[PDB]
Design a protein around this ligand. Structure first.
Ligand SMILES: [Mg+2]
Ligand SMILES: [Mg+2]
Ligand SMILES: [Mg+2]
Ligand SMILES: [Mg+2]
Ligand SMILES: [Mg+2]
Ligand SMILES: [Mg+2]
Ligand SMILES: [Mg+2]
Ligand SMILES: [Mg+2]
Ligand SMILES: [Mg+2]
Ligand SMILES: [Mg+2]
Ligand SMILES: [Mg+2]
Ligand SMILES: [Mg+2]
Ligand SMILES: [Mg+2]
Ligand SMILES: [Mg+2]
Ligand SMILES: [Mg+2]
Ligand SMILES: [Mg+2]
Ligand SMILES: [Mg+2]
Ligand SMILES: [Mg+2]
Ligand SMILES: [Mg+2]
Ligand SMILES: [Mg+2]
Ligand SMILES: [Mg+2]
Ligand SMILES: [Mg+2]
Ligand SMILES: [Mg+2]
Ligand SMILES: [Mg+2]
Ligand SMILES: [Mg+2]
Ligand SMILES: [Mg+2]
Ligand SMILES: [Mg+2]
Ligand SMILES: [Mg+2]
Ligand SMILES: [Zn+2]
Lengths: 177, 99, 58, 97, 135, 86
RNA sequence: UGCCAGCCACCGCGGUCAUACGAUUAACCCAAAUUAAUAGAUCCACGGCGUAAAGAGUGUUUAAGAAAAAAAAUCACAAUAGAGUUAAAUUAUAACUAAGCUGUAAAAAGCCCUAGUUAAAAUAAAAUAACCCACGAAAGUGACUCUAAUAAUCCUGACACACGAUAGCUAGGACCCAAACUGGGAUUAGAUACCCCACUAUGCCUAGCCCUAAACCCAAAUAGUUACAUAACAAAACUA
RNA sequence: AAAAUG
């Protein structure tokens, strides 16, 4: 993509290599932002349209206690919330993209709808992705099983620590008086 | 603290250079009735045909030898702004961890 | 091998006379054309002829 | 200060370019045996690039040589000479299936 | 209610200005975290315009000095008998052994390419790897 | 808002205009920060920063829009197409 | 009253259906002034030229203008003008065989000095190569060989100079084949058309004119940039 | 092949 030029280290015989210095620099902020929303009782949803690891995304989300969407994204899901989901619902406060592109190789619906509804989006963007709309983009690899498992485990522990430390903070709040 | 330039210079993929006609070890992680999904480990997973000799010996987790042809099959077509990604790699089967 | 396309169409950057003049833009579509059904033809006119030869002779 | 940074130098893995069968060769109008391999044995047409597989210069040169030899009195136009009919097949066209 | 405009700017600006004007009377929870830890680039929409003319991308190809030796090794003997193991992080290949011999032969004050090549090829026999030259 | 009935179109426009809200930076809450010369599809707009005593000498629609926004002092000239949407 | 009477600056209104015609009431704006007409002031482009009006058919040059930072000039292939040659087909012309040949959806007309095969000058044109993209300023050029040869140490520039497809004119020559026009035969109510046959001007060479094209790639020339930025379609938007 | 008008 034209917008991945600053996020790349170079090109190894046609194949572009993403430098991991800015990847880690972005991932620190990404995990911190993801953990803070979970700490402040926020709804976190893992959007990912990729028919290889979708089962792993629902397993990770269920273990985290957050919500997931790996199936076909309907039209007015995030915009027409009072109709698609229920009379009055709570919009997800954070959207995690593990695969910003769908099976058509087009930008996802949710990355546009989150920007429309002022919903923070943290996303793993590949060399063919568009990071202009993602609030917290992390340049990485989303097609490697080890890379996606690493990202899923990192986002699992980021939520787990946030929730647990919220519980001990509330426990100390109870002892405060 | 080790720097990415330093570890990338010593990465095995850097040592391999071009991926044309290179012998690699891969491990099968998925099995279809006749297609074997072999992860040689570079970026993507190649798909191969089950041979006629010792066909029952190919199971999930088996290590095999591949002659890599291309890391990622992409090409340009008429009126296309970017390539058409196949999300796969090109490789052929030679043996199964001859040791 | 695919025929070359450089310097064929009429563009601002093309200095020479256009070579190819497309009826429709050369954009590869997402669907192929439906297969054509073959036109039928009469059968065994040859054997009908030898059938009628008996009738004309006998 | 990093000594492991990539250096901007020419590609070492640059494979040599493919050559036409007659790169750095001499095409002549008197070599009917050579000119006959690029013409059809039954009709006498001159094969194109997609059939012969020659880079841009030698295709025009072989065409000019055939056209010159056909009028100077060295090669027949309508057919390929049966004496040179048994030459090795260089063209990529297959008639009998 | 809110602002559903994407091309105007980023989400943080469209929430902050709405609250400053007084339309959005409720602070979203993520605004405080954005203020505390902002990202590197503001999430403003930028249209991917095509690049015409003589302009070219600014990415530079990754090439080192060891690639010159690896090209000679692959041109002479091709792929090594020891197949490449990409799972091992500390895996050293036959070409890696060849280039490690080449660098030390260079440090030994040898400037001739033939001397740097054939001597390394013979030295590999001391460790006992088989070289298959391609004719 | 577009509908078969005029009242329905009015209601649709009212309910759909709130969802798309801009914020206009107004210098000292009466005039824009700097003169703006903008080229839209086919409509040219030239707007110049104006003093406190020059109240909304603009087009008859720009005056209404700026009255809704909060701009009290402005001068605007529109050239080319005068299409309302553009 | 009902496309009648009539009204209007533009749109336009007149249906036993008029807030637009005529009258009444009511209302609005001016005011000793109010309307109508004619003159004025102001109003066109520091904008554009692919599809709406616009890039002139081409090159050179005079006058005139910009030289604002630095670089360059010249190579396979069908530029052009002369001279020579012809591989396939076609035909004038002879010999054997047949009574048919050509013709269309079907026919008719025409030719039976016809048709097939074997030999054959002259004229015209130059399969495949060409899925190539070169030459020439443009028009234009691709069967072969030879000679001459393709300006500028390279900005723009006319009403001046030189070219300028086909069509048409004059004189001489050529005429296989194609064909305006014309004469027959089909179809049609008509067919002075599309369909079939024959033939003339013409297409061919030399010399002299004519100076026109959807001469269009509807995108002017010279050096550039991918910055801002999609009226629509189309070949993306732009600078000096 | 054929074939007009409102
Ligand atoms: Mg990817
Ligand atoms: Mg030219
Ligand atoms: Mg068209
Ligand atoms: Mg079509
Ligand atoms: Mg108007
Ligand atoms: Mg009146
Ligand atoms: Mg009136
Ligand atoms: Mg009245
Ligand atoms: Mg005008
Ligand atoms: Mg015009
Ligand atoms: Mg022109
Ligand atoms: Mg003209
Ligand atoms: Mg002449
Ligand atoms: Mg004659
Ligand atoms: Mg007759
Ligand atoms: Mg020819
Ligand atoms: Mg020149
Ligand atoms: Mg000039
Ligand atoms: Mg002329
Ligand atoms: Mg003439
Ligand atoms: Mg004649
Ligand atoms: Mg005729
Ligand atoms: Mg007639
Ligand atoms: Mg023309
Ligand atoms: Mg024009
Ligand atoms: Mg000019
Ligand atoms: Mg549109
Ligand atoms: Mg009539
Ligand atoms: Zn060659």
């Amino acid at each position: 993509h034209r917008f991945m030029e600053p996020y790349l280290f170079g090109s190894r015989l046609g194949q572009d290599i993403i430098d991991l210095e800015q990847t880690a620099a972005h991932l620190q902020l990404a995990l911190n932002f993801t953990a803070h929303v979970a700490y402040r009782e926020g709804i976190i949803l893992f959007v990912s349209r990729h028919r290889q690891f979708a089962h792993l995304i629902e397993t990770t989300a269920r273990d985290c206690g957050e919500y997931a969407h790996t199936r076909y994204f309907k039209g007015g899901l995030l915009t027409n919330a009072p109709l698609l989901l229920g009379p009055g619902v709570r919009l997800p406060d954070l959207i995690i993209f593990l695969h910003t592109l769908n099976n058509v190789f087009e930008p996802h619906v949710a990355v546009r709808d989150a920007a429309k509804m002022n919903i923070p989006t943290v996303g793993i963007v590949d060399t063919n992705c568009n990071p202009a709309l993602i609030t917290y983009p992390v340049p990485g690899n989303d097609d490697s099983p080890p890379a996606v498992r690493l990202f899923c485990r990192l986002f699992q522990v980021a939520i787990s620590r946030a929730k647990e430390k919220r519980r001990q903070v509330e426990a100390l709040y109870r002892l405060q008086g | 603290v080790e720097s990415f330039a330093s570890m990338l210079r010593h990465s095995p993929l850097t040592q391999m250079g071009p991926a044309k006609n290179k012998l690699v070890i891969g491990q099968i992680f998925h099995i279809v009735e006749d297609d074997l999904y072999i992860d040689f480990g570079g970026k993507f997973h190649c798909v191969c045909k089950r041979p006629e000799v010792d066909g029952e010996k190919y199971q999930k987790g088996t290590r095999v030898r591949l002659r890599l042809l291309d890391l990622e099959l992409t090409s340009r077509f008429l009126g296309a702004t970017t390539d058409t990604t196949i999300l796969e790699a090109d490789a052929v089967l030679l043996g199964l961890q001859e040791s | 091998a695919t025929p070359s396309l450089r310097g064929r169409l009429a563009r601002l950057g093309n200095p020479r006379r256009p070579i190819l003049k497309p009826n429709k833009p050369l954009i590869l579509a997402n669907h192929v054309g439906e297969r054509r059904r073959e036109k039928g033809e009469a059968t065994c006119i040859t054997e009908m002829s030898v059938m009628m030869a008996c009738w004309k002779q006998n | 200060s990093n000594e492991d940074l990539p250096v901007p130098m020419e590609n070492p893995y640059k494979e040599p370019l493919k050559k036409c069968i007659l790169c750095e060769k001499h095409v002549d109008y008197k070599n009917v045996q050579l000119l006959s391999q690029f013409i059809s044995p039954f009709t006498g047409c001159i094969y194109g690039r997609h059939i012969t597989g020659l880079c841009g210069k030698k295709q025009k040169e072989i065409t000019k040589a055939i056209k010159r030899a056909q009028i100077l009195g060295f090669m027949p136009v309508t057919y390929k000479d049966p004496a040179y009919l048994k030459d090795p097949k260089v063209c990529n066209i297959k008639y009998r299936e | 209610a809110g602002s559903r405009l994407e091309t105007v700017g980023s989400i943080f600006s469209r929430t902050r200005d709405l609250i400053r004007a007084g339309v959005l009377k409720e602070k979203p929870l993520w605004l405080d975290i954005y203020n505390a830890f902002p990202p590197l680039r503001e999430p403003v929409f930028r249209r991917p315009r095509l690049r015409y003319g003589k302009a070219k991308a600014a990415v530079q190809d990754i090439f080192y000095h060891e690639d010159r030796i690896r090209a000679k090794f692959y041109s002479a003997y091709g792929s090594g008998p020891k197949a490449f193991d990409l799972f091992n992080p500390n895996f050293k290949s036959t070409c890696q052994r060849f280039v490690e011999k080449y660098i030390e032969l260079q440090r030994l004050g040898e400037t001739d390419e033939e001397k740097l090549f054939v001597e390394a090829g013979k030295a590999l026999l001391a460790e006992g790897v088989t070289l298959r030259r391609v004719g | 808002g577009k509908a078969t009935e005029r009242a329905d179109a009015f209601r649709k426009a009212k309910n759909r205009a709130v969802h798309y809200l801009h914020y206009i930076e107004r210098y000292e809450d009466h005039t824009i920060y700097h003169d703006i010369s903008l080229k839209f599809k086919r409509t040219h707009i030239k707007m110049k920063k104006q003093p406190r005593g020059y109240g909304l000498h603009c087009h008859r629609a720009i005056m209404t829009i700026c009255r809704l926004i909060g701009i009290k002092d402005l001068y605007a000239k529109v050239s080319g197409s005068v299409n309302m949407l553009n």
